[PDB]
Amino acid sequence: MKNRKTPMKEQSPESRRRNFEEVALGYTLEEALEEAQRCLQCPTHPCVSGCPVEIDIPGFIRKLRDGKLEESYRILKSYNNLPAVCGRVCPQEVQCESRCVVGKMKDSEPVAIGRLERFVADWAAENLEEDVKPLAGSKKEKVAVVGSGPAGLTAAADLAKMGYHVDIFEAFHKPGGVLVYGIPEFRLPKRIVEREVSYIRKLGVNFHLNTVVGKTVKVKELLSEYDAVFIGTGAGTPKFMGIPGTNLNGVYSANEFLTRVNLMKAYLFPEYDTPIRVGKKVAVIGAGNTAMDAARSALRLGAEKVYIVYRRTEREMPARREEYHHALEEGIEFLWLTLPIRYIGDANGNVEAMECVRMELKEADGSGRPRPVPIEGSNFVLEVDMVIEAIGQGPNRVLLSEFPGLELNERGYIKADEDTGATSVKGVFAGGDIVTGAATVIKAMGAGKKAAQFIHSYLTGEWNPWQK
Amino acid sequence: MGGTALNEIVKKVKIAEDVFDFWIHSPSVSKEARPGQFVVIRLHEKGERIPLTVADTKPEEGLFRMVVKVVGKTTHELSLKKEGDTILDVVGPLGNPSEIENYGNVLLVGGGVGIATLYPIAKALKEAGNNITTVLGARTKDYLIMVDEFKEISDVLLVTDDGSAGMKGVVTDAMDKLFRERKFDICWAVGPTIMMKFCTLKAREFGVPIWVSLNPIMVDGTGMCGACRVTVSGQIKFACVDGPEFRGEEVDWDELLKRLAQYREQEKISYERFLK
Ligand SMILES: Cc1cc2nc3c(=O)[nH]c(=O)nc-3n(C[C@H](O)[C@H](O)[C@H](O)COP(=O)(O)OP(=O)(O)OC[C@H]3O[C@@H](n4cnc5c(N)ncnc54)[C@H](O)[C@@H]3O)c2cc1C
Ligand SMILES: Cc1cc2nc3c(=O)[nH]c(=O)nc-3n(C[C@H](O)[C@H](O)[C@H](O)COP(=O)(O)OP(=O)(O)OC[C@H]3O[C@@H](n4cnc5c(N)ncnc54)[C@H](O)[C@@H]3O)c2cc1C
Ligand SMILES: NC(=O)c1ccc[n+]([C@@H]2O[C@H](COP(=O)([O-])OP(=O)(O)OC[C@H]3O[C@@H](n4cnc5c(N)ncnc54)[C@H](O)[C@@H]3O)[C@@H](O)[C@H]2O)c1
Ligand code: SF4
Ligand code: SF4
Ligand code: FES
Hints:
The complex is a heterodimer of chains A (468) and B (276). By secondary structure, chain A is of the alpha/beta class. Chain A contains 16 helices and 13 strands. Chain A has three domains: 1-130, no CATH class; 131-235 and 396-468, no CATH class; 236-395, no CATH class. In chain A, 31% of the residues lie in helices and 15% in strands. In chain A, 51% of the residues are buried. Chain B has helices at 27-31, 73-80, 114-127, 148-154, 172-176, 193-200, 253-260, 267-274; strands at residues 8-14, 19-25, 38-42, 50-53, 56-58, 63-69, 89-94, 105-111, 131-137, 156-159, 187-190, 210-213, 229-232, 235-238, 245-247. Chain B is globular, with a radius of gyration of 18 Å. The structure holds flavin-adenine dinucleotide (2 copies), nicotinamide-adenine-dinucleotide, iron/sulfur cluster (2 copies) and FE2/S2 (inorganic) cluster. Residues 89-91, 146-152, 169-172, 176-178, 182-183, 212-214, 232-234, 289-290, 293, 320, 396, 399, 432-434, 439-442, 444 of chain A line the site of one flavin-adenine dinucleotide.
């Protein structure tokens, strides 16, 4: 009906479908001011309750409308290390803007809170700079950070500011995590990631790139030569369904496809030396953000037909709703309640087809809230020359075993205190997907914040969870 | 200053037409390297990640050996690199180390460049006190040469050229000509997938089991994507984490051969490069 969000510049679907430039272009200042005036400044501010780290949302929006952008950035920065990221990638539809009261008005949309966080962060990022430092020579203790994702970057940043020696160890050649090899450029521009890394680098943090912990440097070395250790290795194995035809040429994990496309930039081939297989008709299994970004990455390679194949319905799709629509706008087709059975290959080796069925709801909760059961005679085949499986990911099973006394959870993730981040091993902390499983950037950020604070508290002698 | 830098190419030596041998300065990688392991490298910023084996290490001086065959762009560019040049990315040591004990009489079989991979295993087996019989095959004779100074110094060597010293042709024929003498329960195959397939197909044997060093397509090399996917026995293994060395009997050879040809369009980046 009435109060909807303020429109922002976006790439046209037909033009952006073949290139990797960012789709959401970002608010102009006047647009940000227009959106900011929509905030009712609720004294009870339920919006804050919708935020995983409970950012002072009406505060930074208010300082924005008051033309005080400097204070707005600092308000955000007190709560969130990576606001230029979360403004872009947060599923605001199920978090903060899901709790905005103006959305509770009759047929009205919530204040674009994610967009305003994005604006303030970007406005102060693209042009404005901060300061110099390092202050990380103040304290005596050395800390080893494993992984340069949202968690490791945040933890390292906070510990450096606190004065401790911080060594980040990264396996790949570019920092870090999902922000470089996971999420594509048309969602999260890498300039932002490189910027934050340089910012953390300017804080005095030492980056050990091309270093696989447990291999390049052994676990028991990290434990010997450091005062504290943060395990922020995230989770990506990945997981293969294991159905027949999995070993066929043209079948991909979303990990390999995206690592090639995002980190190795196979779409700029042959400028970049990393190749990728042709895909005129491609099927991506799953409806998560991983599946959605993969399919969207595939279409930009010259794909004629791109299909989403999902076991459940639309409403159950975990992907970011804006990005779901974006995928639709690019021409990607969605198949709900469909489960692949096998992959059919040719004599020369190549995926030509895929056997599938349809699904329905029967049992309550066998496994997963609406556990789906296949339907007989719904069995059909789909003609695809490329297949990307995005059904999930897992923790690093061998690496965790090299940590003596480290206790795992239900199925492989680290047992770690939610607030302190302290594990069963003295001085060792952890956070992000390596603890919670698949989750959000903002939560990985927050875990990095909390762990860093209690590493500080621990290294000062104040607090010690390891007694016996 | 005036000295050695990270990932510096310390010594480069051209030992065959399209085969090049490198000694690279990497203290960490050289110190932490176990026999059977490998590294993944990237030459330039636009470059790609490719896996290459550690052929030897000198931790005290922090160097590691690698021998490369030129089959395409990246190996070519690495060969054109000169002494003093640096490789942009070097990650390792990756893969699972060889299983090294004091078994008995051991047979080793290797092809051209795979011999380099087969070398630190030999040394390690001889480091554990094994009595070795080594078989050396190559692309040619001294036009494309195989390293004699490695094996003959390390063990008793039978040379299996494609028409020169020792028997003439495929190395499986040299394993075949054990017959009268032979040995007790180990054989190793490192080379192109076809040769490793056949040395496995030695199945007649004397009832000797084969260790094989697989060479699938790799991206990260850390077990994060599954490009190096291999079916061992009936089950799926990752040769970068679970391998690269497996038991040849359990290795699915036809599917690996099929997967090594998965990208054949890669010849394009060789052509644009070969113009220059
Ligand atoms: C395709 C994809 C899309 C996503 N989209 C969204 C979204 O839209 N909105 C949202 O809120 N969340 C999203 N997420 C989730 C979010 O990215 C993660 O929850 C968050 O990044 C977790 O941070 P992390 O540090 O725990 O893991 P990671 O970001 O994966 O950090 C792992 C880092 O540590 C390195 N590392 C791992 N093991 C080692 C080791 N042994 N030695 C050295 N280095 C190591 C890795 O190379 C990597 O650089 C997405 C995730 C994926 C995979
Ligand atoms: C553990 C492991 C250790 C290895 N050690 C050595 C070694 O010591 N010396 C050596 O010469 N080779 C070695 N290889 C094989 C080597 O990785 C490939 O020859 C390499 O990928 C060649 O790629 P490129 O230089 O041509 O560049 P790319 O552009 O990446 O390769 C494309 C071209 O190279 C051809 N090619 C041949 N093999 C491969 C391959 N595995 N992957 C992709 N393309 C391939 C392709 O047909 C194509 O023409 C090893 C492989 C593994 C898995
Ligand atoms: N698997 C590994 O660990 C590893 C390590 C390095 C190189 N390689 C491989 O080396 C290969 C290139 O080989 P090359 O150029 O040195 O020479 P090549 O292809 O001619 O093989 C060298 C020798 O292998 C022996 N051989 C026996 N049967 C064979 C057969 N049926 N087919 C081929 N060879 C047979 C022969 O003696 C031949 O001389 C590459 O494809 C590279 O992948 C593998
Ligand atoms: S709820 Fe919507 S309106 Fe009320 S404060 Fe948070 S943002 Fe401003
Ligand atoms: S962090 Fe994610 S959730 Fe918390 S505010 Fe910024 S956007 Fe809304
Ligand atoms: S190289 Fe990607 S998982 Fe082994």
